[PDB]
């Protein structure tokens, strides 16, 4: 069940598709980035078409939608990473086993591209090229994180196995989310940019 | 896609089903266990019916079967654990982030034994305060594997010039595997819980 906006992959399961500047899709993703990173220079935006990662993610989304009894479990967030991690993320997505982990040992996603645009995350390569993903994240029901978490806390100590879906720095006004399971995040776009 | 011989869970997503001795399903597991654990005695064998873990695992299995272009990707292995871990595993499966360092480490992942005798060690299946030991019987997507190394946080690449094309798992010995390490969620389905005692 591959999304309508994907382009044909000639019976293959993985493609990075460079977006056409000035078309609706490129404009939408560029605007999400320029909301907070208007001082940067965008080289390109690529759509990540990874059928396997999409499949596993959509299964987790369906499960979380059932568990939480609503379809408000997904957020579009940003993730800055170094060039050497990009091939791994494109093919395998986010891996907590691979910076600070102040809110738990998971994968960190920013509400604002400006946070992910920090050199500590989107490490500039030899040429100053920086890499940021636009990510579909199953944040679901979240709570405040803390150092040393390996999974989200339980929603009630009385049922230790019924967990929050993610944690954040601040429940009232979140700026970051941490997820602790594979296939809770789908890397949808890769932005290549410079300061 | 839930298996047709599972008990009806009346829209519930999770059930543990106590098996009857003399049923083929119980006897095959008891035989697999007693092959190497004949000094122990089984209290009970429970079938783990976890709809969400099954769905995610079967998706991974289909993907691995496609990628590897054969259906030799799944092994039935053992996993000894402490009583405090059983509720988590039943609900959420095997979390590498919680895994102990193995006394012989072939990587930082979840370990599964070919032989029940390995998993039966008190170091894994820690006897609880009532002397009950706990061992899972696990469908594991071992796929294509290589000898592991203690530094691994993912399986190694098949080819160093293509670092993202990975082995599916690692082992202690490719010619005579006795343990497998997996590094991803939903690569192992806890199918049965064996409760046993000395
Ligand atoms: C407080 O810890 C982190 C750690 C990593 C991280 C953030 C915050 S925001 C962001 N964007 N990409 C990566 N990250």
UniProtKB/Swiss-Prot annotation, chain B:
Subcellular location field: Nucleus
Tell me what gene encodes this. Answer: PARP15
What name does UniProt use for this protein?
Protein mono-ADP-ribosyltransferase PARP15
> Main role?
Mono-ADP-ribosyltransferase that mediates mono-ADP-ribosylation of target proteins. Acts as a negative regulator of transcription.
What is the recorded phenotype of mutating residue 124 to C?
A: Reduces catalytic activity 20-fold. Abolishes activity
Give the protein family. Belongs to the ARTD/PARP family.
| Highest taxon listed in the record's lineage | Eukaryota
Please list the residue ranges annotated as the PARP catalytic domain: 2-198
Q: What is the effect of changing residue 80 to A?
A: Slightly reduces catalytic activity. Abolishes activity
